[PDB]
Write a protein that binds this ligand. Structure first.
Ligand SMILES: OC[C@H]1NC[C@H](O)[C@@H](O)[C@@H]1S[C@H]1O[C@H](CO)[C@@H](O)[C@H](O)[C@H]1O
Ligand SMILES: [Cl-]
Length: 485
């Protein structure tokens, strides 16, 4: 029965540390976290904002508010998942507060605007630095990858005691906007709204030069980005690229989609190699976040996945390539949409979150990875919780031992007073009993081994072998066998 237990984590508020890098919510959180403990919660997740910590200048790390926050988490007796948040808070759905990346990094952009992901009209997205500059020493002598590595190293040295005490158990490495390994292909600030197909955000000069070099290297130096792709708010049928039997199927289109999605995979791999070196020997799991682009999943072109950088089609598994890249690092996948049913989505959007969830979870498990999930949108109701329960144990309870597959964890978005009062709290507490297979809370479940060094580097051609043949997902039960009631 104990093999069935799934840990439950709760996301702290976006301003758990204030926008001025001070810890102001000690009284409120102490109460709120006591309520989470009373409900059997295993831990919390928190954004560790680059903009707050390295805000005053290069290598001026001010960890003191996060230390106060983390002491409080420890005193409550909860585990902790730390996100290395190298992105801006703001513009993305649910972001109530405003925390840019460091001002001194933005100041570099006033001279070299190509440090930012750039769209086809030339608009600069300031939420994250382009993967184009991962290895370009533009930031007062440092590259973007060096900045990320130094930040993680300073985190390790400063939070060593929380690491040694087994409080911090997971490091989620932010790899893009909203901390997700993707391009900013659906930005509300540039006028996108649901369920627009999005746009390819590869027009910064660094990525343009990368494309020309890749194209010349296959004997097509003339080739350019596709220009029959429409705009943010189009539907697929209204573009020659994404329509049924469109130019996404051409040799040119295929080369472009591979190049764009490959760069994301290489960005993840490089950064995970550095993260693994940092946390070598500590009892933590490294994780990445894959964004849940469920819209247009039901049409042949998977348009919105393609623009986000996920090269996923009926005969090409664009998530198992990513999982295969992660395997050498023993990195986990944190996914989203665990609370969503296809019947809750609008028809127009051609949306299939249930199938997308099944695809990504099955890709992780086939590669031997731990897989965790989050809810995409706020939900307080039994149905949502039952949908999560189904995804947490897709073949139900195993009475003899553990089930064939299960989530390694589930993180709930997001803590507030609303969660810990009234009927909301009764529902949530019941949901946590069910995720624990109705057993008491066990702080020593899922012990981590000392992080081993990443295995040998494999090439992009080796990673891409996972794309085909595309396999059906493992069968999922329609409904959980252990509902909230
Ligand atoms: O948690 C990742 C992402 N999953 C899909 C949800 O719809 C999004 O709201 C979240 S992003 C959100 O929360 C993150 C973790 O607290 C932040 O890093 C990010 O800035 C927020 O936009
Ligand atoms: Cl296989």
């Amino acid at each position: 029965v104990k093999g069935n237990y799934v840990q439950v984590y709760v996301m702290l508020p976006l301003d758990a540390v204030s926008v001025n890098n001070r810890f102001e919510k000690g009284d409120e959180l102490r109460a709120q976290l006591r309520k989470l403990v009373e409900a059997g919660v295993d831990g919390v997740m928190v954004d560790v904002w680059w903009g707050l910590v390295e805000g005053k200048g290069p290598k001026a790390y001010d960890w003191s508010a996060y230390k106060q926050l983390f002491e409080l988490v420890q005193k409550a007796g909860l585990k902790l998942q730390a996100i290395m948040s190298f992105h801006q808070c703001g513009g993305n759905v649910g972001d109530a507060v405003n925390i840019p990346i460091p001002q001194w990094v933005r100041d570099v952009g006033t001279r070299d605007p190509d440090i930012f992901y750039t769209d086809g009209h030339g608009t600069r997205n300031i939420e994250y630095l382009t993967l184009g500059v991962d290895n370009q020493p533009l930031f007062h002598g440092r590259s973007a990858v060096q900045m990320y590595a130094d930040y993680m190293t300073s985190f390790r040295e400063n939070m060593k005691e929380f690491l040694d005490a087994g409080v911090i158990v997971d490091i989620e490495v932010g790899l893009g906007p909203a901390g997700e390994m993707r391009y900013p292909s659906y930005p509300q600030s540039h006028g996108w709204s649901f369920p627009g197909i999005g746009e390819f955000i590869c027009y910064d000069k660094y990525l343009q030069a990368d494309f020309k070099a890749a194209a010349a290297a296959v004997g097509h130096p003339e080739w350019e980005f596709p220009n029959d792709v429409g705009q943010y708010n189009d539907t697929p049928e209204r573009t020659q690229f994404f329509r049924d039997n469109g130019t996404y199927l051409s040799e040119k289109g295929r080369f472009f989609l591979a190049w764009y999605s490959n760069n994301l995979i290489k960005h993840g791999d490089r950064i995970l190699d550095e993260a693994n070196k940092v946390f070598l020997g500590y009892k933590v799991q490294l994780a990445i976040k894959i964004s849940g682009i469920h819209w247009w999943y039901k049409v042949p072109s998977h348009a919105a996945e393609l623009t986000a950088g996920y090269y996923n089609l009926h005969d090409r598994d664009g998530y198992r390539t990513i999982a295969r890249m992660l395997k050498r690092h023993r990195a986990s996948i944190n996914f989203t949409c665990a609370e969503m049913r296809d019947s809750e989505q609008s028809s127009q959007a051609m949306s299939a979150p249930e199938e997308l969830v099944q695809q990504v979870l099955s890709a992780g498990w086939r590669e031997g990875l731990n897989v965790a999930c989050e809810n995409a949108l706020p939900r307080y109701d039994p149905t949502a919780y039952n949908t999560i329960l189904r995804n947490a144990r897709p073949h139900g309870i195993n009475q003899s031992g553990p089930p064939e597959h299960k989530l390694f964890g589930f993180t709930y978005l997001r803590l507030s007073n609303q969660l810990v009062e009234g009927q909301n709290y009764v529902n949530f507490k019941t949901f946590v009993d069910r995720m624990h297979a109705n057993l008491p809370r066990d702080p020593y479940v899922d012990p981590m081994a000392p992080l081993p060094r990443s295995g040998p580097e494999i090439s992009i051609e080796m990673i891409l072998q996972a794309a085909q043949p595309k396999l059906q997902p493992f069968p999922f039960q329609e409904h959980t066998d252990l509902p909230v009631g």
